[PDB]
Symmetry: C5
Subunit: 311 residues, 5 copies
């Protein structure tokens, strides 16, 4: 075959809809996710039209390579989609109803600034290249767009699956291409991170601060440096969950700022000990007593400085 | 082709059965598992019926694309099934017997609340979309549903493979779809976890508690902080076996509660030492002697508080 | 096509043979292994028989989908086999010679009780489903079963590749199925494990025992707890080589028993120190001197208790 | 089919262009990256030419296996490309316009000398083998070469995608082959590495240096050796991001040089302690006080020695 | 089709050549590597021969399934090769020129005795099975065997790609098979390993030896045991780069021998301390002073004992 000829000089509207049956494998590091969904297309090809009265049953089915079907292709995917054709129904008036079920690996970027309290807007871009004999445009059949009540993306809640109704079209290598935008919004399930990363990472920090109620370098070094080792256990665990962002993550800031509250603690401790060899135990254990508040304070300030700075 | 015409105005019962030949790769983190099984279908298409007497042999075989075969598709899979067709036998009266062997990667969620003492109900959902010319319904051929005596899902015992006989059917994008539910129940083999995770994780905790029979900060810090390091070895090992649940796991609770019995131990130790610089060795080593029971008690209580809270 | 009609009322013998060209990727954790082998089949279909004298060359070749070929399928595989057809030769008398080379991922379980001193019996099960018009049986063409002198399964020696000549056949969903059993026996190359896991894991234990010739808690805690950290390095390395068995592995026992000889060492040390604060340096360093033999003894006993218990 | 016959004795120019739709998965260790792009070809086959006036619409479409299409193949790929054919338009004068969209895994080496401040020149080599009946040459259709404003290669900025216009051609196994060179230049997003690797790796080093303001071996050993442990945490993390280069990386130098500033620190410390048993506390704590500047100096020198040496 | 009939009673020589376009992914652990190469075949089938003077152009091209092409198959591969056919040219005299480009994952074992200073001989074995009607033999077209100036196998230098000209042929399941042997020799790029594994692993050892210039058990235990921890960091990193060999690696020996120079160091230290409690500070610090040379000596001896033993 080859396309429907234009009765006027109009371009052909093709009526698209994506209905999600599964979302799975949101891979943060990779900035991807797998989807499994119906893709539903719908266009007018009068060449196929017919008389219901004489022909018998209302609507006519075709095997795929019988009729002309538009080159609808996903933009932002790695795996060029794996699809079964489900039904092709042609209505009396030459209007076609195409349905495939597909699954593909989509490549939408994620913004980690607010990790692990972030939300995202995933993107499934649909395209169609316009042929020789006529232009083609896509548009949204808002009733053939949805998702399942099953659909669970482990570690995220799912807000909306909507579609930007207006396809911005444009010239790509001499011909026109029409591009739609489907939008899956999600919010990270942050609960996990409290008792798995934050509360522990804090306890091991707080332990470090017990060297303010001690005056034994021999022991304080152990206190602070050992807990720094323990903290390092949890920096290398968090920084490889995520990709190398060229912008600062919020968790990453918190974590990096902690590397001072160890560094500076060592300084205080190293000083308190210094002065006590230099015999000013008054001035030494002024500092050390100060710290007992300075540290918890400057922390609760500076986490609130950051909190605001990031939200 | 195209479907059997409805003699009355009835829908079309299709007679389904899944017989498991292999279950494997239950992936906890992914919330998936691979299955390899016969799918057996069975429907009435009178167009194919015949006279055995004037025939040859009793029953007639067809190559797949010869006859009309219903669009039976798995719902909750990532890999749209890999299938070889095994036999299509048509009985004299137009009743078809379809058999394929398939294997697919199924995506059923697991509830980790009781890990690693949990059990699960896996789900293989079968669907069929209803065509223009008539509706289609599924139902269970209870004699064509089973599993092998071979079948072993490493790290789980397998209870039942049954099927919810009544398919709840419903409207999806204008047409009807009929959905069955096959149910594989399993229970985790928890033995591994005793001598691999729990008993060790306890010994390293108990060691921490030897700092109640000591009065040497210089050493006690080492005792408690080192064992905390060792414990951290086993938190990062358990917390990446599993997915990030937004609900509290039972193992996760135990583990998180342990991070206090290190934190609080440090407090006690830090205090006992504090008081000894402030000269109340009586009051100091009252506490220290108390702890010798307080800790083991509050633990056996609070593990039994949790145990109950989770079971 | 459809099968050879039975001249008597006999079932059809199909003459099977597997010749291994490669075994590779024995995956302990997965309980699998990849094989790459000739599958050779051989049956009598008189419909194909012919006159050599008049027809020309002695034996006739056919492209696969020309003749009737039996549905031979592997039972215990994940990847339903990838096969090239190599030759189909039909002898004058209607006897067919089928040869494919295949490769597949086989799923045979392994028994780890004796790891890493274990041996295994891998299993490649061949099946054939019996048709409508006649029954089918498999049997072994003992001269078409072997393996290469190349074949190396890294980390295992390979004993035998034999086949249980008698196929136990049986009824599966109304029809007969005939199942053969091919058996690849292997023994683990345990040498690696001596200087990589056992000898080191022992040295770090023996170091722990230097705290019996010391009377400095400050230091002994360090000695024992540090070496316990080092030992933990090698428990988490061994326990993820293997799958979670619900039965006790021999290596796992040894390892778990070691977690006492650290625990109990801490006890002794914690005691020796205790008594020295309570002023019985005699009784304290009686124990400590006892231990110097108690420990190495109770170890050589209890590894020999286990050794016998497991062999 | 078979090629266009040469009107003169000229070779055939084929007009190539690659338009990148996605770059992703730059795998440093593997020295690869996945691309997804239009490949656009364009040649003159007069056999296909026609009269527009009589034939109807201006330009003629063909299904792929209808016409002769040149054997264009990618050189430096692992996955021999996955391609859909998009359009084949033949202009009146026998000039063909071929368009496929492809995606492939490209194998271009990366130079890590300046990691993680490096830039790279990726390479997509296009080839065509020349046939019996005539020679074939490639050349660049500079207007059909570009990339998207979407295209993001996580962790890199993308400079240019250009093409070396002149294909160097040559004899390979008796016949000619013509090879083009497309060039994707990129620069690593180094920001991530400051607060994730460098600043921490420095703090843990600076802590080591607090043992110059201390005179307690018992503690200094702890200070220096513990921080060396912490540093080892970050050497094994960096050295497995990257491949085993046979040339010195810049990060690797820095890191390896740090292993001296621990080694030499131990020496100083071990000495200061030695002398203090030998009773020259003057000479001992001359050294120690010297070091307080020697170390930070020799570091700022030697990082600047290297910095220059590498840039 | 079916083969060329033998004019005499000779077997058919088939003229093979492999030209490497890419080698990549030498996987030490797996004992594999991916190759991407031309396979070029060449045989005499007179049935295809012709008269150039009357037929027109010198040489005739055929689509693959037109002519008889020999069953050439790779022996030692996991992935049964992925191939495009490039050209089939038939010369006037019935001699065929076949060319495919293929890529496959080859399974050649590597000998790790001398790791990481080893070299290897990779193996790509070509086979052909001999038919009913006549025998087939392979042989090398030495001018159609080579490699690219591009070809880079990251972490190895590439010496030669040659072919054992004489195919040893043999009987496999009743018929003859002819097997060629192509040989890719490579040498490991060992530079990486000096500043990444050996020099550090030595510094951490040398630090251990600073406990000979100290007489503080409290501290020496820390010195030696901590550095043993640090060394363990680098044993578990080296021992999982490589497969479990049943023979001793050279790196593995060095590493295992190091586990004594920690063990024995502990002994010395544990002794020096013992004697100081038993009051022979002379005899104690005789040993300690001896060691200061004993250790570095016995090391430079015993690494040279081994060096020789392995080379
Ligand atoms: C020392 C620790 C040894 C623990 C062995 C528990 C026995 C068990 O595993 O008990 C099983 C129940 C699960 O309940 P179920 O629905 O009956 O299924 C299982 C039916 N079986 C048993 C017949 C197969 O889990 C529990 O209550 C777990 C108790 C918490 C123990 C955690 C220790 C914390 C420190
Ligand atoms: C230091 C790197 C910082 C990167 C942040 C980027 C832009 C400035 C901050 C903008 C506010 C962004 C927002 O909160 O939405
Ligand atoms: C902390 C979040 C906990 C969520 C679990 C929900 C309810 C508490 C437990 C109820 C019993 C549920 C059950 O185990 O059957
Ligand atoms: C604890 C779980 C024990 C599992 C194995 C059962 C019994 C111990 C050994 C029995 C003898 C088996 C054998 O050696 O063949
Ligand atoms: C010591 C091993 C050094 C290997 C690198 C090779 C040459 C030295 C550096 C040359 C400058 C390279 C450049 O910056 O262009
Ligand atoms: C311990 C296992 C050692 C095995 C090496 C085998 C034989 C002894 C060495 C012979 C020389 C082999 C060589 O190094 O080229
Ligand atoms: Cl697509
Ligand atoms: Cl499906
Ligand atoms: Cl290609």
């Amino acid at each position: 075959v080859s396309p429907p000829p234009p009765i006027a000089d109009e371009p052909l509207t093709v009526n698209t809809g994506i209905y999600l049956i599964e979302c799975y494998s949101l891979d943060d590091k990779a900035e991807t996710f797998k989807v499994n969904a119906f893709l539903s297309l719908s266009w007018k090809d009068r060449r196929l039209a017919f008389d219901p009265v004489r022909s018998g049953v209302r609507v006519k089915t075709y095997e795929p390579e019988a009729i002309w079907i538009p080159e609808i292709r996903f933009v932002n995917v790695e795996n060029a989609r794996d699809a079964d054709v489900v039904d092709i129904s042609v209505s009396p008036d030459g209007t076609v109803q195409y349905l495939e079920r597909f699954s593909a690996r989509v490549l939408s970027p994620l913004d980690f600034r607010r990790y692990p309290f972030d939300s995202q807007t995933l993107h499934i871009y649909l395209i169609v290249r316009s042929v020789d004999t006529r232009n083609i445009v896509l548009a949204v059949d808002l009733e053939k767009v949805g998702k399942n009540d099953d659909v669970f993306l482990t570690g995220w809640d799912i807000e909306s699956f909507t579609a930007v109704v207006k396809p911005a079209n444009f010239a790509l290598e001499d011909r026109l291409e029409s591009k739609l935008d489907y939008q899956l919004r999600i919010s990270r399930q942050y609960f996990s991170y409290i008792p798995n990363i934050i509360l522990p990472m804090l306890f091991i920090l707080f332990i470090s601060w017990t060297a303010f109620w001690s005056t034994s370098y021999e022991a304080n070094v152990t206190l602070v440096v050992s807990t720094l080792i323990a903290h390092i256990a949890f920096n290398i665990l968090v920084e490889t969950n995520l990709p190398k962002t060229p912008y600062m993550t919020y968790t990453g800031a918190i974590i990096f700022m902690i590397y001072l509250f160890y560094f500076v603690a060592v300084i205080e401790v190293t000083v308190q000990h210094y002065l006590k060899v230099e015999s000013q135990p008054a001035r030494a254990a002024s500092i050390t007593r100060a710290s007992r508040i300075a540290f918890p304070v400057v922390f609760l300030l500076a986490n609130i400085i950051l909190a605001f700075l990031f939200f």
